[PDB]
Amino acid sequence: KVFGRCELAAAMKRHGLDNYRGYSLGNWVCAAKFQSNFNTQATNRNTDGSTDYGILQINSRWWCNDGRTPGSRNLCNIPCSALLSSDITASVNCAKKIVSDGNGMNAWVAWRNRCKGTDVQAWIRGCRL
């Protein structure tokens, strides 16, 4: 599913991400935009052999099982495929664990490089919420 901007903002809010660990909703929307273009089915291989999955490009090295990432963990206890669903529940729940891991949203490289410190509120402008 490719979410619209406001549609994703609303879903993220309903699943408790607005201000989760102190991160306003636009931070989440911005991170999703640059990592997946709001496409739940996005996958991208990493040089180390792991793969990123879903709207928030969650990595198989630590967070989900895809059966092909040697030495990896599955800290969110889910198949990485769950992160590709039109229902963002698994992606959100896993993202809550990731953002609580110690480094906040710096766990998402694209957020650090493209969202952090910017006017992220712009990502939820005009949205009913």
Ligand X SMILES: *[C@H]1O[C@H](CO)[C@@H](O[C@@H]2O[C@H](CO)[C@@H](O)[C@H](O)[C@H]2NC(C)=O)[C@H](O)[C@H]1F
Per CB under 6 A, residues contacting ligand X are 46, 52, 57-59, 61-63, 98, 107-110
Binding residues for Na ion, total number by CB under 5 A: 5
8, 9, 3, 35: which is closest to 24 by C-alpha? 9
Segment interacting with Na ion (CB under 5 A) among 4-12, 24-32, 61-69, 95-103: 61-69
Count of H-run helices and E-run strands, the chain: 4, 3
Segment interacting with Na ion (CB under 5 A) among 28-36, 73-81, 87-95, 107-115: 73-81
60 binds Na ion (CB under 5 A): yes
Q: N- to C-terminal Cα distance for the chain? A: 20
Residue least distant from ligand X (Cβ):
59
Residues of the chain by 3-state class (helix, strand, coil), percent to 5? 40, 10, 50
Segment interacting with Na ion (CB under 5 A) among 1-9, 40-48, 56-64, 94-102: 56-64
